[PDB]
């Protein structure tokens, strides 16, 4: 038997919007401001845009099969000296250029591509609050596909083994381009190292076809597993 309870609890914080209403670190892009001839300093870094370099946001997203959302990107930039015996540096400015698929990838930190006449670029000044941009839903499909049970190519009879071979589960449905990051400043006498942490927040989220969450450690961009295949601990059947 039960009594009458005027329930007041709501599910406001468990809406799909609220569940994803957080900035999650999806990448740590390392760049160096240094003399070009050092050959150990990366004067620019190219990171392919994805949520699969980290696990937390990946697991939350992969609770579902399909998603549709706008994205907010927040860039937190940290920098430090690498040695103390080569003087100091002036405040650095960073270029973060979005290179959509097909646009020329920079080959050098100061090549023509950084003119960014058509690529969106964010110039961030060190010490300023973390840079932020928004993008709408840009999928070429009607939703993003977290899982694609297929191939980009179908091998055909009479084709050699090398031909028609494509990775399982790899489709251009998630080809979103890259971010190219450089320090715009010419080098100081001392080497400086910077990290740009990219934080992703889905907004106006819609999701479809829920899935059981990842239970074993992720292994690659796919659903493959190799290690940690025993997540359940030991517990007696009649032990409270």
């Amino acid at each position: 038997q039960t009594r009458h309870v005027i329930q007041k609890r709501t599910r406001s914080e468990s809406t799909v919007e609220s569940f994803f209403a957080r900035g999650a670190c999806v990448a740590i892009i390392e760049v160096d401001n240094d003399a070009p001839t050092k050959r150990a300093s990366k004067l620019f870094s190219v990171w392919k845009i994805t949520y699969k370099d980290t696990v937390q946001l990946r697991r939350k997203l992969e609770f579902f099969t399909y998603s549709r959302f706008d994205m907010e990107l927040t860039f937190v930039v940290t920098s430090n000296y690498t040695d103390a015996n080569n003087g100091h540096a002036l405040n650095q400015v960073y270029q973060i250029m979005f290179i959509p698929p097909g646009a020329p990838i920079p080959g050098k930190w100061n090549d023509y591509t950084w003119q960014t006449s058509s690529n969106p670029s964010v110039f961030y000044t060190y010490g300023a609050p973390p840079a932020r941009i928004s993008v709408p839903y840009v999928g070429i499909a009607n939703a993003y596909s977290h899982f694609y049970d297929g191939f980009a190519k179908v091998p055909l009879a009479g084709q050699a083994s090398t031909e028609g071979d494509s990775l399982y589960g790899a489709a251009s449905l998630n080809d979103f381009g890259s971010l190219a990051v450089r320090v715009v400043n010419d080098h100081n006498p001392t080497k400086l190292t910077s990290k740009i942490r990219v934080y992703m927040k889905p907004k106006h989220v819609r999701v479809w076809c829920p899935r059981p969450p990842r239970a074993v450690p992720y292994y690659g961009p796919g659903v493959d597993y190799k290690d940690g295949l025993a997540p359940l601990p030991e517990k007696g059947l009649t032990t409270y």
Partner: protein, 175 residues
């Protein structure tokens, strides 16, 4: 059995009646190991606070010729966890006739001192105990399997809610 399919199966047999439990587990849907990795547990492990009733369904997977009655009990916390059917029957409970219905659902109603329980093992917000016992016994005729399996399922009722989004301990990244 852990980390195999066998971990989902609880074996009943046709032995003589006893009052000892078939299975026992605590009502900690986010932190009890049997419940933590259920879909409900997985969702709750992204939240700090939870409240509401739970549904525990049990499916009997023996032969059609098997008969029996079981007792499924929820004991609110604060007392010794039911060691036998005599104690368990004092709490909330349901009698399940496996011959009649292969599936039995027991609703564990929300009963708590706090308006929300934590999603960790916590004495102050402990949720109580769930146990299963033989009411009479499993009976089979000849030429019938004398051992069979039952399966347990858990879900949240429509009054269930969670609060205080948090990161889960169920996924980690190395290096």
């Amino acid at each position: 059995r852990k980390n195999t399919m066998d971990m989902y199966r609880v074996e009943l047999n046709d032995a003589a009646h006893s009052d000892t439990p078939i299975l026992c587990f605590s009502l900690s849907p986010a932190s009890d190991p049997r419940l933590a990795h259920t879909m409900l547990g997985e969702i709750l492990n992204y939240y700090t606070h939870w409240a509401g009733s739970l549904k525990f369904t049990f499916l009997f997977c023996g032969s059609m010729m098997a008969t029996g009655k079981l007792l499924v009990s929820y004991a609110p916390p604060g007392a010794e966890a039911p060691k036998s059917r005599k104690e368990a029957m004092l709490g909330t409970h349901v009698i399940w006739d496996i011959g009649l219905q292969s599936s039995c659902t027991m609703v564990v109603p929300w009963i708590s001192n706090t308006t929300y329980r934590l999603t960790i093992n916590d004495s102050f917000t402990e949720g109580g105990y769930i146990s299963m016992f033989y009411q009479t016994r499993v009976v089979v005729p000849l030429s019938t399997p004398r051992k069979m399996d039952i399966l347990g399922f858990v879900s949240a009722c429509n009054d269930f809610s969670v609060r205080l989004l948090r990161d889960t301990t169920h996924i980690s990244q190395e290096a």
